[PDB]
RNA sequence: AAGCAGUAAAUGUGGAGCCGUAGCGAAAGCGAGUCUGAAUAGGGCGUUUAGUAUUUGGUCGUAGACCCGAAACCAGGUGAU
RNA sequence: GUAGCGGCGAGCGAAACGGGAAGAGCCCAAACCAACGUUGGGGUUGUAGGACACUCUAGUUACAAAGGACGACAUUAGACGAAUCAUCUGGAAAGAUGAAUCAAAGAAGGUAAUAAUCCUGUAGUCGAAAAUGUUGUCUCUCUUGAGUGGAUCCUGAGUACGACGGAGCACGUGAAAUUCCGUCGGAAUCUGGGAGGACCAUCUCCUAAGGCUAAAUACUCUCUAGUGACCGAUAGUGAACCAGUACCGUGAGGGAAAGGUGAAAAGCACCCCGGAAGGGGAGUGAAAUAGAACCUGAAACCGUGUGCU
């Protein structure tokens, strides 16, 4: 019910860590897919409109350029990718920050085990209710369980997961915890 | 791509220890009947890069 | 939490651009001058460039050769050996496994920098003239 | 149709050089020689190389 | 690092590899010392010796490289209404 | 960006080890044994092979020789598919205010306004006359492997290589090995021949002058599902409109401008002025300063009236 490690959830949160893992996570998951023509990537526009001398006509040199409508652009997107590293040890750091920071919370409640022979989404909801949890809600179990997830899924503000599939978008996310009891335990040898 | 090295300035200094570099001389080469013996003899020694050279060929030598 | 995010005091900075006004100081001429080489878009002369002196690499001359069979051994001090336990036998195969030695290139050299401060047996490839004075005199005995 | 009937021996491409290294493309042909040799038929007139009707051959 | 397993998640594995802990000499080589020299006689460069990974900002290098503008050069084609 | 190359200037630029993806290897010429320049046997190489003398009960047409008969999954139309009723403001409810519901379905798009329960769909679960593709089975064809001696025999020639003139290897003829083309001269034969960066000796590792071979790699006209801290009508493909079309040139070629009434045409029957165009009433609609030169309607610019001057 309420058995502590102060290694893995008691630590202090360190929070200038915490920005940049939340940070890198974020940059990850956007896809350039974006990109604009230039001078050489539009069409035509090969010769010159007239000649440079001649006329009180301001000089030219092809139809296609910045300054002319319909054509060319200077510096626009490119595809490109925003992903980037971090150490391995600065990973792991922050990921207890974020345990931590829901303990300190009383947000934090361990559950026996689950029992779901087959996916009923409102007996799950009535789970939800006599433990009063929040509206957002993360559940984690030590391997995946089809009908702990399938029961869940379509709740709104509900999130399923592993004990190992964790990250810290989905702790801050969510405004309480459920982890199973054994599954407690398997999460904490990892993280050391 | 990575920046090149300038292969004509790493054949004629190298890298001390508290990042300096060493070169030669010159006046070296011919003529020494022209020259005299103190001349020429205090010439055989080694110099170091100017703090004013340094300014003008830094990345010409970053992977030395 | 996700809603009152800060970052780290001093720890980020906004770029700054040229080009858009007076009141910035960056503006029409964005900080490149007046009517120069310098000034057009495309660069201007190489860094080792003297403008039509002779550089300084020309006036200097070429020194030395390289050397094919060029060997080079990792040094290890008579400080790096207090940690092994007294009358211990070290061996480079421990030296690149305990954590002493990272990467062995042609062999492992002992050199005597220091003091050994235990008595032990050592076995390398070449010793310094006084690393093998002091780790005769803690006891034991070293060898090739 | 030039080339040996033996052989393959063709003309190939190269380069001229002059004292100062300048460079001038130019040919290097093949000793092609007519000359009438035996074919199941009937013999025929063909362009053979210098190099092939050496040793000996039949005409 | 590539790769492998993962939701195009960015986590877990993966220690070939790179930098640092020791310099000096063209080199053999020696080593908290080394080079020059008959000579630690003197002098030169070291023993000052904290580093490393990721990232915001400034500047430089290779790419058109802050934007617009030539007189020309070469290649393959179209034209004696 | 190391070795090295370079009017050693500007500049150019390796490989082998080590870590990975993938991963099988075979068929001929020759010696020889039988037939009158069809291929019939025999045989394929370095911890030396074969001919020649000698012990003697699986493979599959994607290389390795190739021609078919035989069961199951997918592809090209579909089908079924849970759960809502009132009140207020509206021209209209999905909004607000209350009470009920389904979820392995709260992805989306429509519907007179903002819908999990109104509509088409989604989760999930089923379906194929006939025609393609991928395969699995037996069928079908084709199929003798270890060969201890070892004197005599066999392998691929105007080839290997050298000189001269060129090119190519990171390497500009340089001390330039290794690889190619043209022209001439021209080897050896298992006690052989080639390489290890000129060249010689020793040692070590290989066996040229015949051929074939899947997988790991590159690319996208055009398909079927999807995705975006990409564009939103001077933007995005030149082209959201029937656009390579108006137009220009003898020709090869060059090349635009043009989206929006309303929820629903419900697109103003009828009267009046006028030759018409246009307009004033009436009527439609929530709104006609929404009447097709039709959402919103900025500035330049052009008019009328007026307080002060």
């Not at chain 1, 350029?65 to 925003?82: C, D, E, L, M, N």
């Not at chain 3, 336990?85 to 920098?113: C, F, M, Q, R, Y």
């Amino acid at each position: 019910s309420i058995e502590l490690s102060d290694a893995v959830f008691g630590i202090e949160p360190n929070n200038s860590v915490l920005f940049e893992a939340i940070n890198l996570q974020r940059a990850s998951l956007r896809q350039g897919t974006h990109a604009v023509k230039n001078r050489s990537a539009v069409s035509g526009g090969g010769r010159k409109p007239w000649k440079q001398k001649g006329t009180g006509r301001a000089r030219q040199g092809t139809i296609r350029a910045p300054q002319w409508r319909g054509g060319g652009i200077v510096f626009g997107p490119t595809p490109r990718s925003y992903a980037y590293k971090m150490p391995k040890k600065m990973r792991r750091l922050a990921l207890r920050s974020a345990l931590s920071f829901k303990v300190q919370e009383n947000g934090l409640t361990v559950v026996d085990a689950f029992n779901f022979e087959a996916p009923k989404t409102k007996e799950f909801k009535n789970v939800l209710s006599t433990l009063e949890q929040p509206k957002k809600v993360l559940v984690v179990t030590e391997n995946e369980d089809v009908n702990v997830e399938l029961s869940a899924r379509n709740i709104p503000g509900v999130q399923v997961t592993t004990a190992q599939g964790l990250n810290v978008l989905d702790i801050t996310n969510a405004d309480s915890l459920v982890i199973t009891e054994a599954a407690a335990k398997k999460v904490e040898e990892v993280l050391g | 791509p990575k920046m090149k090295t300038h292969r004509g300035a790493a054949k004629r200094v190298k890298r001390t220890a508290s990042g300096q570099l060493k070169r030669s001389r010159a006046f070296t080469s011919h003529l020494f009947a022209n020259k005299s013996t103190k001349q020429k003899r205090q010439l055989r020694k080694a110099r170091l890069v100017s703090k004013s050279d340094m300014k003008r060929v830094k990345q010409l030598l970053a992977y030395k | 939490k996700l809603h009152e995010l800060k970052p780290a005091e001093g720890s980020r900075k906004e770029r700054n651009r040229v080009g858009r006004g007076v009141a910035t100081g960056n503006g029409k001429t964005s900080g490149r001058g007046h009517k120069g080489q310098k000034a057009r878009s495309g660069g201007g002369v190489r860094p080792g460039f003297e403008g039509g002196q002779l550089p300084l690499f020309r006036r200097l001359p070429k020194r030395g050769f390289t050397n094919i069979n060029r060997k080079e051994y990792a040094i290890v001090n008579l400080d790096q050996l207090n940690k092994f336990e007294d009358g211990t036998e070290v061996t480079p195969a421990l030296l690149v496994e305990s954590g002493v030695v990272k990467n062995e290139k042609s062999g492992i050299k002992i050199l005597g920098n220091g003091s050994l401060d235990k008595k032990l047996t050592v076995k390398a490839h070449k010793f310094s003239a006084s690393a093998a004075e002091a780790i005769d005199a803690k006891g034991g005995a070293h060898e090739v | 149709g030039k080339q040996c009937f033996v052989t393959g021996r063709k003309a190939s491409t190269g380069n001229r050089r002059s004292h100062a290294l300048n460079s001038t493309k130019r040919r290097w042909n093949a000793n092609l020689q007519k000359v009438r040799i035996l074919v199941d038929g009937k013999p025929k007139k063909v362009w053979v190389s210098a190099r092939a009707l050496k040793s000996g051959k039949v005409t």
